[PDB]
Design a protein around this ligand. Sequence first.
Ligand SMILES: [Mg+2]
Ligand SMILES: [Mg+2]
Ligand SMILES: [Mg+2]
Ligand SMILES: [Mg+2]
Ligand SMILES: [Mg+2]
Ligand SMILES: [Mg+2]
Ligand SMILES: [Mg+2]
Ligand SMILES: [Mg+2]
Ligand SMILES: [Mg+2]
Ligand SMILES: [Mg+2]
Ligand SMILES: [Mg+2]
Ligand SMILES: [Mg+2]
Ligand SMILES: [Mg+2]
Ligand SMILES: [Mg+2]
Ligand SMILES: [Mg+2]
Ligand SMILES: [Mg+2]
Ligand SMILES: [Mg+2]
Ligand SMILES: [Mg+2]
Ligand SMILES: [Mg+2]
Ligand SMILES: [Mg+2]
Ligand SMILES: [Mg+2]
Ligand SMILES: [Mg+2]
Ligand SMILES: [Mg+2]
Ligand SMILES: [Mg+2]
Lengths: 116, 87, 101, 70
Amino acid sequence: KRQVASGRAYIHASYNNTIVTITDPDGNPITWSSGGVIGYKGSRKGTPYAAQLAALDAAKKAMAYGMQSVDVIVRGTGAGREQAIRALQASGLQVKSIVDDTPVPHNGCRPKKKFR
Amino acid sequence: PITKEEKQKVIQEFARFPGDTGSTEVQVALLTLRINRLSEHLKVHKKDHHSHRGLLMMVGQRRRLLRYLQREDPERYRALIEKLGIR
Amino acid sequence: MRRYEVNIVLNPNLDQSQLALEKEIIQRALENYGARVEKVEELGLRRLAYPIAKDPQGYFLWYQVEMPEDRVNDLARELRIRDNVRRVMVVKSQEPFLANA
Amino acid sequence: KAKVKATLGEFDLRDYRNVEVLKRFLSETGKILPRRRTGLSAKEQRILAKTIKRARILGLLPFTEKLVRK
RNA sequence: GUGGGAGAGGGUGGUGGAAUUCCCGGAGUAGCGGUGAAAUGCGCAGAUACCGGGAGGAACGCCGAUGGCGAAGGCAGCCACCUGGUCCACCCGUGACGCUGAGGCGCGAAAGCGUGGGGAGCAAACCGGAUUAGAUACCCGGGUAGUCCACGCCCUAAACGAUGCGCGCUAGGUCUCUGGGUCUCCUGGGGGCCGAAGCUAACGCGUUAAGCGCGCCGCCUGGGGAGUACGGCCGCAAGGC
Ligand SMILES: [Mg+2]
Ligand SMILES: [Mg+2]
Ligand SMILES: [Mg+2]
Ligand SMILES: [Mg+2]
Ligand SMILES: [Mg+2]
Ligand SMILES: [Mg+2]
Ligand SMILES: [Mg+2]
Ligand SMILES: [Mg+2]
Ligand SMILES: [Mg+2]
Ligand SMILES: [Mg+2]
Ligand SMILES: [Mg+2]
Ligand SMILES: [Mg+2]
Ligand SMILES: [Mg+2]
Ligand SMILES: [Mg+2]
Ligand SMILES: [Mg+2]
Ligand SMILES: [Mg+2]
Ligand SMILES: [Mg+2]
Ligand SMILES: [Mg+2]
Ligand SMILES: [Mg+2]
Ligand SMILES: [Mg+2]
Ligand SMILES: [Mg+2]
Ligand SMILES: [Mg+2]
Ligand SMILES: [Mg+2]
Ligand SMILES: [Mg+2]
């Protein structure tokens, strides 16, 4: 029960699921949710809908830490990135920014054949 | 590598008269210097073949040239082997 | 001899005495690998795009030298050594090609 | 969408330690921009790359940066 | 010769940031991953997601191109050295010195071999999970050689432009890389596209010829048997010719 003032939220959006981890302005987490966290199990884990609810339960759990406004990092290309945004900004958590940190390499690492 | 200084010391060494720039002895001499730097660049760096292709190009050219001397003038070939210390 | 720009970026938080020590050792070895200095500029503590040694700022100087080519690499390697040196780069100097063309 | 070589002062692309000019040639992220949005020619954009990398190594210029808004 | 170029042409030595993995700590809680759907798998010895730090290997994002270099094979972060080829200018030098090339010699993607290092990601074989009638597969989760480095062998290929090299002549037009020029333009050298003549079985080729000619090398002569057999040679072997 930490009384966390304002802060910053990370949307990690893959093809297969959507996870939201919200942290203090310092980088250390507070609360998080994914589609697997709410009801959904199989492929439905990566729905845009399941994503909106991840970001939603995350903003709620967070709202009760006295989280107020976040700077939203975005990483990943997935469906359910957009519903993750709209979920946050429209949670009444007010959005101080949104970003793209979405890391792509300078070509060092051979990928799995599924990715050539 | 090679500088105009060096190059010139040789040109003027082997210029068959003053102001000779491209004559046979001259051409061969320039060649020999090129060849010796390269060769010794290859005494280490055996691993760089491409430049060795270069070496081939050059040895051949100087050998044609030289043959042409031996043909034209046994004398210039005689003493340009005295000087240039080869074949 | 050939003409090179020696870029030495060092640890920003050297006070003067330290700073002149590193500045000096740079110089004595510079002189000892046979490198005469045609010019120098100390542009001092400039800020960084990405942290070097987690340090948002670094201290820059530059030496245009005429030095025997064989040793350039070695010389770099000496200036490298110091713990207070952050980044070293020797350029072979260039006639300055022009822009908006 | 303006042109980012096409208004600026005449200069040296070979000058690796000059930020104020060079960082203009980068992007809303750390990326060296296409001749399309610069307007340097062939030879130009080559030397430009080479020095921009020189600066990136030297610390002055970014390897990357993050897109803002979204 | 001289003067001026451009370039991932080669070797060696350094070295820089991104990302993956792993270890270290932080904060944090039930899942993560994965699919067509899912299971195997990993997770409360606290994973996924975020921050900090460290380690190590490998490869080089954007610039990057319809681009450039090299004889090919091939070559892409930055620096320095060591070097190969090459283009234009000047018309300065030699005076046909030229072309091609059986043999020989050198190079030669990857895979593979021997010794010695190295091993992050990937990944034959393998080990599991699916899926199907079955699935010795396609999909999923692991993983070994190997991929990396050195030295040494191997010498193959759709090693493709499926087009040997050199020189001479035969409308243009357009895009282009790189030189020189009294700089919409002219003039050399590369790379593309359309096309005169002409060629072609047609498709197409056409000043980067598959056109008109000359030199010189390699080569073919119905399909299968067969790139097999025998012989010889090379190779540690696999195998090559
Ligand atoms: Mg799922
Ligand atoms: Mg140091
Ligand atoms: Mg941990
Ligand atoms: Mg378990
Ligand atoms: Mg090829
Ligand atoms: Mg060269
Ligand atoms: Mg004349
Ligand atoms: Mg005469
Ligand atoms: Mg020949
Ligand atoms: Mg080979
Ligand atoms: Mg190999
Ligand atoms: Mg091996
Ligand atoms: Mg081994
Ligand atoms: Mg697999
Ligand atoms: Mg694997
Ligand atoms: Mg083995
Ligand atoms: Mg051929
Ligand atoms: Mg011009
Ligand atoms: Mg042309
Ligand atoms: Mg045509
Ligand atoms: Mg016709
Ligand atoms: Mg028959
Ligand atoms: Mg036999
Ligand atoms: Mg035998």
